[model samples]
Target chain A: SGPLPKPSLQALPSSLVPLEKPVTLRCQGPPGVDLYRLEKLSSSRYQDQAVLFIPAMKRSLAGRYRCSYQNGSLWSLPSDQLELVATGVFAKPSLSAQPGPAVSSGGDVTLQCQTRYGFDQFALYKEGDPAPYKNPERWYRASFPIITVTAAHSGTYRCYSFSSRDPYLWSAPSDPLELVVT
Target chain B: GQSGPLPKPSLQALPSSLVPLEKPVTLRCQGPPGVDLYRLEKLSSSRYQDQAVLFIPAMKRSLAGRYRCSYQNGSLWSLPSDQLELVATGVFAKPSLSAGDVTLQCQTRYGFDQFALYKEGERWYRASFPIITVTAAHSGTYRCYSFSSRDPYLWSAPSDPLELVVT
Candidate 1:
């Protein structure tokens, strides 16, 4: 009948984990809450249970996750975004949000993926899927912009460097940047 | 029958393990290429369909079961995918309850083998039926769910809430 407490989300063994290693994404809320729903990249990927256990973390599973709990008919505010990074690939890139990460809903934000390597293409990964926001031969960095931000625009994002010479070999990953819609 | 064993594929429920009746859920068995024949199995149900995609058009309580899948190459078989349990909800009419002098009873009218009790919104007790004495902690909004032990995950809709007053 009233607003519920926001939930908490965290990755165990640390947020930056090695690839193929076991990882657990845990979501917890204040007492008196029933079912917890986990959102992978905020894409309605419900876990049903509070814990999402990844026995052997695949490269594809690396991304942001947030969660909320159901109290009666209402859903609580989302928890903090947990970015599960997959390590041990190539060197990690640098990621930063321009004009800061927090913005009023409907505002625009740009995420820059910078690297020392001269990679040909860049890809942006949302908390859910690998959306290739490619900019070929864009010097040493790629800028991803979210315009007219809605609640859906709020999520954790990371950029990857892929040299077209060998498309399969991917850069480790840029540090995660959270885009908060205030 | 030819090569040894392929890598283990991933098995995940499309949305969630708990789904409402007639809702669609896909048991995705993701495997690498060279995987030709896909075999999906159930611990308490049946085997089915080709390819790694196991789709259910409508969910029912009878379909609530644990499932796993393995992919087959020309002659070799991949290791079984991780186990996933699918739970169906809203399979029956909502449960009904009445409380008097602290004997809270839930009646789904017949074949519900299990009942879960919740105080406020958190689950407090589960049993064949709620037949317990009163405690001060038990004074709050109470609700319950009805299901069968055969498929404990399958649950009916929750009963209407009853407020219990404490002295």
Candidate 2:
């Protein structure tokens, strides 16, 4: 059969602000599209792909996003970028220690990030300037990690990733993840 | 440490009784001796060493089954306690199939590589993706369930029967 026409991009429920709440932008593309390339064309231009996960929203996350679908064949033309202006509403991402909250010093602890909704694939950074932790292993449903508790490791953590290819993205760091070193 | 023993764990849920296919449920466990991580596991995994959350995103005919939970803390594991069986009171919705070469993706959500997709009395293929090239002989009922060596005492019931209609 002729190359299946480019799958369509349907904005499930567009027009969300505050970026704090959960939301999902699904693309119905051909089977070959292993990864979706998302480009943020607003604020600061940054190009990234495989951004299927969306965490809670953030005000700074308010922007435009454009995405291109790709399979074995070439990538599809950039779809109409969507504009999201998040003002007051925001669903602060949350991190929790599993089992129970009280973690012992010098022991292992698992931190989890949960938001309203979005694509999968998120990165976790301890604080200030640092590289993201990466996806799948880092952000999937069972994206929990075991960390050896230490006083130095205790600090605020955050996650960041572009919504799609459009300028819209995730801004406003996640609620501080206080790593208590007993 | 100035304590006797760890505190006991506690879990609570709203609406003591669950309706058949409606109502989303959340069972939260809190605890003793203090647990830092807890997961809901399908009781079929008898050993209960590996823990997983039993998620029923939507109450479909396939979500009915037996489930339990376990938690790990520091270097110790909370004895796999608390067992509950969830049942949906409704006949299964009809299963459909696609024409031509369609992939009959039968996945067991809470299973860890111990799943087998069986076409009832036909073929039992062991793979992540179950596909059957449609000819005339590829029409029948397909379902998925799991069993593990660690837990030989239990076997999950098959999924809601899917009637693959290949044209």
Candidate 3:
């Protein structure tokens, strides 16, 4: 309960795990520290970190991770950064369109992604698009809203899911969902 | 000789009508079949018109404004349609929060009448300015949102979270 050693964070299974599978980044420090903080350093110096508890791993979770511990108001220096690698683990997610795949021009549409297990993050990808449209943190169900769809919005779409802790680790891509604009 | 009534034109944004600042968007104007050319206008203090479907490959914060549409055939011009307020979100830079005399500043593009201050745990505070005075209990990750009096619920996407330590 006195002065304790600086906390250290380590990735279970050597920081490399399959996607969709659960991974634990354990934080161990000297006695007296019950609270731990996890930090994800970004390129722009804008870091995203919070209390540590990685229930599952996703592709977005890819990044350097560090931890710090605090006893009351006093804090400890951050632990050394650990790299987490997530590969294919769980099955591919499933993508479907609401009200069928065809929609009138300037109509509203929604794309839903269903995963084998409840995921914290779901991403929708349209063919020819460089980047996927990401949904906010959600449970097993994730929906991407197309407020008012146009002809250009018609394309082949897919989806994937991952847990909040493992953002970079994305499940396999789902079957393509073709959207037609009439 | 009198001119006939001008058929109304409809305006809509393409590739998802919602304004997400991170992506490109186009404003398409639909009018009568014989409409040879289209005019896209954003309603401000005056009318700002652009030829044909207005295309913005990359949207900027300055483009956020009210928009309307009209059509031109020969010398006759059609009346403008209802205005569409295109408010761009997530275009501004992420706000930075530095520790000061127990104060946090949510800095971004100025001129917003409403700002939302939020702690990582979902605690939120709204204000007319970006500055927020804090106490030792307010220590946590903070983010902010910018809005206007026109639409209170339409707010800019949150800024990056800033970790604050008060000891």
Please give, for residues A93-140, the per-residue lDDT of candidate 2 as tens digits. Answer: 554444434544444445555565563434455543244942221222
Give the clashing pairs for model 1.
A41-A127, A41-A128
The DockQ figures for the candidates are 0.01, 0.01, 0.01
Candidate 2 residue-wise lDDT, B1-167, digit = tens: 54333333444433321324654554555555546677665554453323233344445444445556666677556654555545443232212222133354444444434444556566765543333343333545656554443442233455555444322
Off by over 4 Å in 1: A1-182, B1-7, B32-34, B43-45, B73-75, B96-108, B116-144, B151-154, B160-167
lDDT of 3 by residue, A2-55 (tens): 544568788765475566667777777777665777777755242223335457
The residue ranges of model 2 lying beyond 4 angstroms of the native Cα positions read: A1-7, A10-13, A43-51, A87-182, B1-167
lDDT assessment of candidate 1: 0.68
Model 2 chain A, poorest ten-residue lDDT window? Answer: A135-144
lDDT scores in order: 0.68, 0.46, 0.63
Off by over 4 Å in 3: A1-182, B1-4, B45-50, B92-146, B150-155, B158-167
Models sorted by TM-score, best on top: 1, 3, 2
Report the error of model 1 at residue A116, Å. 60
Per-model TM-score of chain A alone?
Answer: 0.51, 0.38, 0.42
